[PDB]
């Protein structure tokens, strides 16, 4: 078996190798890259996203979202307190003020060393989950305002036609800025994409060990998890890696600087934070191999995770047992 050891994976794909999504996703694939639960992309010299982010400003953050922390320094859950709505421009603005500017440091060690140690004591603004792409129309490689959706996929496979869309979102960050451990909807993939601005950090645990995390969770947010089986699908839990090796948590750490893309693998639980001002675009995906994971996939049916419009057809196509139960969650 490729990479047995579950390591994070790069990949450099040539020009001609940046032509084929789904093929270039299979190679990685092949390469056993899936293992690790995340894969960076380097995207070739001669592509770009867009010729530049010079008229971004105007872009409208509806609701900015304050990320409120309890508990210890490395084991907290946060929760959003909703802002008034700023542009970019003034996004990036407050970013760069004292009170939210990354803090000084020798390097990428050190600022993560300083993020879980002070975390908890500061509330950073996030703008998350913005319906929207920064993809130059004209870019035509892994331009993620035109993958094939997740329906035509559940299509090809299975022979229904289901409702449903599946657009990108942009999410605005600066430092401290943090998303808490998850798989994603249905444990589907995920594709990011860093468009400018500072890092963002992911830790990520192997696929074939989430079980593992989930238990560790369930010890440290005895509450939570009283209150709901999946928990995690609430995307408010963090676990620092200190606090994973102690619990003998396998997992792995990489930073992602702009340009890069981030693949995320079904059923890889992932959480990171971002180093300061930064905008990325991500949207999920699906593969012939997710089939199989969407079926099992956790539902959260307590109410607080509350998804999209198109959840509902994957759960009452690939969980009918589970669609009852869940859309009583949604409503
Ligand atoms: O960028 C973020 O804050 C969160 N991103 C993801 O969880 C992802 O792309 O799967
Ligand atoms: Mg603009
Ligand atoms: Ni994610
Ligand atoms: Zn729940």
New binding site residues.
């Given amino acids: 078996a490729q990479n047995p050891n579950c390591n994070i994976m790069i990949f450099h794909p040539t020009k001609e190798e940046f032509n084929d999504f789904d093929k270039y996703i299979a190679y990685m694939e092949s390469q056993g890259a899936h293992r690790a639960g995340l894969a960076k992309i380097i995207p070739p010299k001669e592509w770009k996203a867009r010729e530049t982010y010079d008229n971004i400003s105007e872009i409208l953050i509806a609701t900015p979202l304050q990320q409120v922390a309890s508990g210890r320094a490395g084991v907290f859950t946060q929760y959003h307190k909703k802002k008034k709505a700023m542009t970019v421009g003034e996004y990036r603005h407050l970013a760069n003020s004292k009170k939210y500017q990354t803090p000084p440091h020798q390097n990428f060690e050190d600022l993560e060393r300083k993020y879980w140690k002070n975390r908890i004591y500061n509330s950073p603004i996030?703008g998350?989950d913005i319906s929207g792409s920064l993809f130059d129309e004209n870019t035509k490689q892994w331009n993620l305002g035109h993958l094939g959706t997740i329906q035509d996929l559940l299509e090809k496979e299975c022979g229904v036609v289901i409702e449903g869309v599946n657009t990108p979102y942009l999410?605005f960050?600066m430092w401290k800025?943090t998303?808490a451990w998850?798989t994603?909807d249905m444990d589907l993939y995920?594709?990011?994409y860093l468009h400018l601005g500072e890092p963002?950090t992911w830790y990520v645990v192997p696929p074939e060990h989430g079980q593992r995390l989930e238990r560790l969770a369930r010890e440290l947010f005895p509450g939570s998890s009283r209150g709901c089986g999946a928990f995690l699908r609430h995307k408010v839990a963090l676990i620092s890696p200190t606090v994973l090796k102690e619990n003998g948590i396998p997992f792995n750490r990489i930073t992602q600087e702009a340009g890069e893309f981030?693949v995320?693998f079904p059923y890889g639980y992932?959480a990171?934070f971002?180093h300061g001002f930064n905008c990325?675009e991500?949207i999920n995906f699906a593969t012939p191999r997710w089939i199989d994971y969407g079926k099992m996939a956790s539902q959260c049916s307590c109410g607080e995770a509350r998804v999209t419009f198109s959840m509902d057809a994957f759960v009452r196509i690939l969980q009918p047992e589970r669609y009852d139960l869940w859309k009583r969650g949604q409503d």
Avoid: V
């Fill in positions: 996030y998350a999410y960050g800025t998303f998850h994603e995920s594709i990011n963002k981030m995320t992932h990171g971002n990325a991500a």
